[PDB]
Design a protein around this ligand. Structure first.
Ligand SMILES: C=CC1=C(C)/C(=C/c2[nH]c(/C=C3N=C(/C=C4\NC(=O)C(C)=C4C=C)C(C)=C\3CCC(=O)O)c(CCC(=O)O)c2C)NC1=O
Ligand SMILES: [Fe+3]
Length: 216
């Protein structure tokens, strides 16, 4: 197998194909072209709320585990608190009972717990997939959402897309990739981590196809 490369390199080469598929999914495609409504935006953000909540809960559970510990950046990355602000903004005071919890979202959340509870050595695959993506297309989707729905530059309703503790996401991404290469990595784990990364992308693709359908 390809163990002659660093985990960050293996992950990038392993997910580049499905990434193109995920990037050109119907829901994302629309969002990219400015075509994004309040109804849909609220659907995906509520979904991300449940997802990041599960991911970050598993991160806390395994924060001391060396298979993940070097990547424990709650202050800089975690989105749960940010998404809670966003839910209050979009759904109001009682968002805990108003926000949806779709099947595709539940599916994603279920795999997150399985990994965090049973296969924690794979958890890095899920943080990698979501966090780095946020740091890459984060400012892009944000500027689009603002132009489309008239969200003020002050950021209310888009806290999720804002990283106040990260000055340069590009530099941080570089740090995160390098830190990923310091994890205990056997040919067995690296092999499985890259596969789980694909699964994460697929889970994201399945969420989008589901939301797109709900909207149409
Ligand atoms: C959407 C756009 C416009 C985007 C662009 C984009 N993705 C990149 C990285 C990436 N983007 C992703 C992830 C994602 N990216 C995806 O489009 C989706 C749906 C995921 C989520 C599953 C990852 C993990 C990286 C890093 C690849 C690597 O450098 O290791 C880079 C290089 C850019 C600028 N990323 C965005 O999120
Ligand atoms: Fe991306």
């Amino acid at each position: 197998d390809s163990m002659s490369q660093d985990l960050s390199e293996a992950l990038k080469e392993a997910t580049k194909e499905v990434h193109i598929r995920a990037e050109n999914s119907e829901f994302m495609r629309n969002f990219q072209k400015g075509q994004v409504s309040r109804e849909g935006f609220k659907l995906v953000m509520a979904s991300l709320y449940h997802i990041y909540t599960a991911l970050e809960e598993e991160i806390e559970r395994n924060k001391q585990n060396p298979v993940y510990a070097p990547l424990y950046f709650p202050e800089e990355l975690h989105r749960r608190a940010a998404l809670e602000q966003d839910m209050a903004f979009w759904y109001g005071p009682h968002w805990q009972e108003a926000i949806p919890y779709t099947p595709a979202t539940q599916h994603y959340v279920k795999r997150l717990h399985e990994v965090g509870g049973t296969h924690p050595e794979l958890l890095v695959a899920h943080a990698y997939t979501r966090y780095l993506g946020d740091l890459s297309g984060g400012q892009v989707l944000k500027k689009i959402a603002q132009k489309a729905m008239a969200l003020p530059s002050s950021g209310e309703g888009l806290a999720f897309f804002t990283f106040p503790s990260i000055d340069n996401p590009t530099k941080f991404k570089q740090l995160y990739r390098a830190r990923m290469n310091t994890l205990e990595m056997t040919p067995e784990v690296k092999h499985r981590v890259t596969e789980e990364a694909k699964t994460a992308f697929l889970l994201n693709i399945e969420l989008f196809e589901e939301l797109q359908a709900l909207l149409t």
